[PDB]
Each structure stands twice: as structure tokens, then as C-alpha cells.
């Protein structure tokens, strides 16, 4: 954070910061917002909760743009435990009533095609929901074997292999290899999406 | 000529510029108010104690309206119409008295149950002043669906929104009764008859 | 029926019906056509896909995270 | 991992890929595959998710509102203008520093500004008078000089001579970067 601020104060082209692993509190995301001398806020909710602290950071600074990235369990790397669906059904309405919310929908996506229905809002319409567009999204996963990447080449050949699985079977992870994924415990316990490796 | 008349209940007053002919009754009706109103608090915080300047010249309508005649034409109804084009000009600014309510729920200190009692007073004070709500209102929804940028669809609840209905009914009949009494008089002779 | 206070502003009460200045005519936004994803084109006739975000940071709504 | 297949594929390609993708199938859904249906303006982005006449002048109290003022002095166009006065930062060589122009057209007691030739951008005319001992004279002159090169010309009426001195301030309007258009030369600044 003080790195952050020393940087920007000698005009570094920084253009935002994004907070992983969980949502600051209200002093330390207004210290981030004010100090920092940053065009927008990323933000990573994983559950519903986390979404109305991220609201309440918004309503705060109501003329300061927050990126809400939402995110599901079927994410790669660290992930929760949350349906990408549910919580965003549950929670659009209440983080359309903030203009400053910049809502970005991430998980799952590797293409034009299975991305668009967010971006036209048509998504929702399969669970009897009115349209719900979104403004953006992230691709995390689908990026890993991009030719400027340092992923090893047999890393890459390793993740292009794994066939993965549609979002109705990504739960399967905690138990067995499923799309050669398999999910795991950090030696602080939280899960993680890795390729079911011998290792 | 005119002449100032406070109106006043602890820190807030109403200078009310009352006509010279109407002086010698205004200021009795002023004199024998004052006593009826409690001792002012703090935050003026007692359920029956005006918090703003409004709810002031809110309770007198109130007080002269209770001591006019509805078929004669007393001394009292030159002093009400006075007060009327007084509250309305500096409080109301040609809006509705509800949406007056509304402003002073958020921007003041004042409870639901004072606003209440604001609304029954004027109401109250518009009709028993000979002077109904004959001219159509400049209702900004109602322009709208005028104008075809709006349409409504009017809903009516059923049984089971709330265990204490009966209220809602003392509500209207207690704040709306000039407007409202008419209509509960004849349900209630209505259904006597039906019985 | 009641007069009273929305703080979310989610609906209105009686006011709303009788208010005379625009605070009378509110109307709760249609998400699809709030939030429609638009095309636009810069001077150099680049097409860009238009959206909340698109619109703060003159690039493709789209970003590869952390 | 259903969707990464495609090995040592270019970064701009995955990308391009996705946002051209949406722009074919809006394009044919809402434009009737017709991309002269899409609107177009100078530069795109520096919106804040939150948000005229050809001859003006503006008068500066010590009550003016900083946003209605630097709203009036932008114009409703997108141009250069546009970006000039509501463009929070400008480049000035890869480092981002506070927009000059803001800070020189920052509004107080004194200070005229006067806009001739606003309706058409490539001649528009932006000039901050103030007083200067006693008599209000010409400070600030902002304006196109070639088609991409905005002239800042800041002026001290008290000099040497009596003749007044000219430090022109330049900067490149590059509207294919729509969230820093405006960047400073910097060559013999
Ligand atoms: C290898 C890897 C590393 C990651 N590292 C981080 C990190 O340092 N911080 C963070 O917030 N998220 C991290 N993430 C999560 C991503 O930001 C993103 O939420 C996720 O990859 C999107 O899901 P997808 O990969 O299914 O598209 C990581 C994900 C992966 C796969
Ligand atoms: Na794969």
C-alpha cells in the first residue's frame, strides 16, 4: 500500500488496485480509495455477505468507481464454495442502486459465445429473473497458454489437455479428478483449483 | 396596513402578518392557544409539542378550525383564511401537504404521528374554511399518464398483511375525516341494515 | 394507503401520487435497457463494445485478473 | 478448461478474439450488420460510471460551482476542448501528472473566460482574462495549432518592456488513447 502511494505520487501510470482473498473494511477501503491516488477499486466478494460490504464501501464514496468482481467456486486457483449464479440473482438489484458499481463478471469463461447471454442480460432468463446485463468480464484460466505467458510448454500442454466440465458437474472437484481438476487444501486450509497431477 | 402577530412554542415562531380590521380577534385566539400548548423540552421531543415553525401554524389551523361553525359563518373564518394563505405560501409553495410531511420526516426531527396531525389540521382547515379541493391538481404523475410517458394499474390487498388492520381504519377516520367520514358513516349504516 | 419513508427508494408512498415537482414522477429502472450493451466508434473508427466500464477506460470491457 | 485448447495463441488474439466476438453478434442482434449504425465520437472513455452556443463568455464569483464551470468551458462536444477541461490527468511521458489546464482555468473572483468559434473544434478559441494592475488583459490562450497539438500560451503582461511575454506550453490530443488523449511534448519544453 505505501508502495502504491510513493509510486503514484511520482506519477506512475498505476490505473487501479485490485484486493484478492476477501473485502477490506470501510477505514481501510476508504484509506485505499483516498490515499492511493487511484482512477477505481477492484474488489473480489466471494459470498453474498461480501457483496453488501462492498456495497457499503461504495455507498461511502458514492462518486468513486468500484469494479465488483464477481466470482464463482468454479473459478481456478483459490475459489469458495458459492454458485456463480445464486448470489448474483440474489444480490443484482442492490448493486444496480450504485452507478459507482462497475459489475464484472468472472469464472468459468473463455469465449465470446458462452460470455455474451451476461453482457445481454439473457442469462437470467432461464431462472424466470428479468434480463440482467453485466459490464465486463475476466478471464483467468483461458489466458494460462497464451504465447507471452511463463507457463512452462509442457504446463501448457498439461493445462490444454484437461477437457473441464460444464458449471452443473464443477462441484465434483472436492471429491475426485473432474475435467482433470481436482480441488485442495492450502497449509492455511482454504481450497484451491489445481490439474490433478500425480503430485 | 397589516401588524405582526407571533405565534410561538419555545426557540421557533410564525411572524403572521394578520390584516388590522382582524387583530382584535386573531390575537384572543393567539392568547388562548398559547396556554393549550405544553411546556417547551429539548429537541421539543413530547408526542403533543410542534418540532418546526410548520407544525406551529399546523396546530392552530387545528385550534381555530375546532371553534368554526359548519352551516353559520362565525368571526374566526376571516382569521383561518389568513392563516390557510399563510401556511400555504411559506411552507407548502403551491406542492401537496404530503409531500410537506415528507420533507420534514427527513430533513427534521419530527415523528410520524406529528405529520400525521400536520395533514389532519390543514385538511381539516381547507373544508371547514369553505374552501374545497374543487381545482384539479397539478399532480406530476398524473401529468404523465396525462401526457402518455405513464400508465397505472390500481391493486387492492386482501386478508393477512398486517394482525392489526383496525388502525389502519382509525388512521383515516382520525386524519382524513373531513374527507373520508361521509363514506365510513355509510358503510357503517349499511351493514347495520345488511345484519 | 401510509405516509412514511423509503430509504432505499425501492417504491414510493402516498407523496408520490400528489407530489407536483419531479420527486412525484419516478420510475424504476428496466435493467435490459439501463444497462444495454451498445456499439460506438472512435474518430479513428475503431469499434469498441460500450458498457459501464468500457466507457471509464477507452478499452474492450474485458481484462485478464490478477 | 472446456474452452483452453488452442497452445501458445498470441495474448491479443484470446482477447480480440472475445470483444470481436461481441461486436459481430450486437452488430447483427441491434445494428442490422450495419456498422455505419454505429455512433461515433472523437475519443471513447474518461466517463465516470456516475454523470451549446458558438460565442460565451464566463464570469468566475467566488461562488461558482468547479464542475458546472469546467462542464461549460468543456462544451457538449467530444473534441479536444472536451478533454482539455474534464480529462482529470495528461501524460507527460509515460508518468501521469494533474491536468495543467484544469489547474491554470481552476475558477475565482476576477477571471473571464471567453469562447469564440465553439460550434466547429478545429478553430475554437478559449481565452482567460484577468486583472492585471487595475486593467482585466488576456492571461491564458488555449486552442488547436496544427490538427493534433493544443497551444496553452500563458502570458505575463508584467514585464521588461512593457510588452507582454509568451510561454507557449504544448501537447499532443491523441484521440485513439480516449483515457489520456492529452499528453505534454516534452522535446525543448
Ligand atoms: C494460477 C492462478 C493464480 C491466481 N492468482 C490470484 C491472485 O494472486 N489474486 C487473486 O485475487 N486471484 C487470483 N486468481 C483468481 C483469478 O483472479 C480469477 O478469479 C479466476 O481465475 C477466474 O476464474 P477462471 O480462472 O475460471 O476464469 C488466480 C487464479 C489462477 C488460476
Ligand atoms: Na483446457
Redesign the interface.
Known sequence: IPLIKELRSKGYPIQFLTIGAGVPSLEVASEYIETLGLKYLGLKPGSIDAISQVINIAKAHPNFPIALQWTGGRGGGHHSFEDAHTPMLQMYSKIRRHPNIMLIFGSGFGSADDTYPYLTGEWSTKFDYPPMPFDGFLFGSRVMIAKEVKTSPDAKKCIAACTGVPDDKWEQTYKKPTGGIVTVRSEMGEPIHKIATRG | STRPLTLSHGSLEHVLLVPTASFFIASQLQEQFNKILPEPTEGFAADDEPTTPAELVGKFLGYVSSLVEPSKVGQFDQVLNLCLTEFENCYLE??????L??KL??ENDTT?VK??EL?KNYITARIMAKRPFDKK????????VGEG??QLVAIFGGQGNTDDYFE?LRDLYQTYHVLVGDLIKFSAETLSELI | ?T???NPDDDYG?????????????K?NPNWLEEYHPKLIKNKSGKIFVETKFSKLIGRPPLLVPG | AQFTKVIDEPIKSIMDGIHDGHIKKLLHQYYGDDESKIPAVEYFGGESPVDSEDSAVFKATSSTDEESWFKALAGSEINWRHASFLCSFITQDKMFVSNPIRKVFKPSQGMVVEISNGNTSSKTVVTLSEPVQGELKPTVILKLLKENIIQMEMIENRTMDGKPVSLPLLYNFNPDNGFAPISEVMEDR
Open positions: 403551491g406542492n401537496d401537504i404530503h409531500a410531511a415528507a420526516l427527513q410520524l405529520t400525521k395533514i391538481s397539478n399532480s406530476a404523475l398524473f401529468r404523465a410517458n405513464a389502519e | 394507503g405516509l412514511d419513508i408512498f402516498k407523496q408520490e401520487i400528489f407530489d407536483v415537482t419531479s420527486n412525484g414522477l420510475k
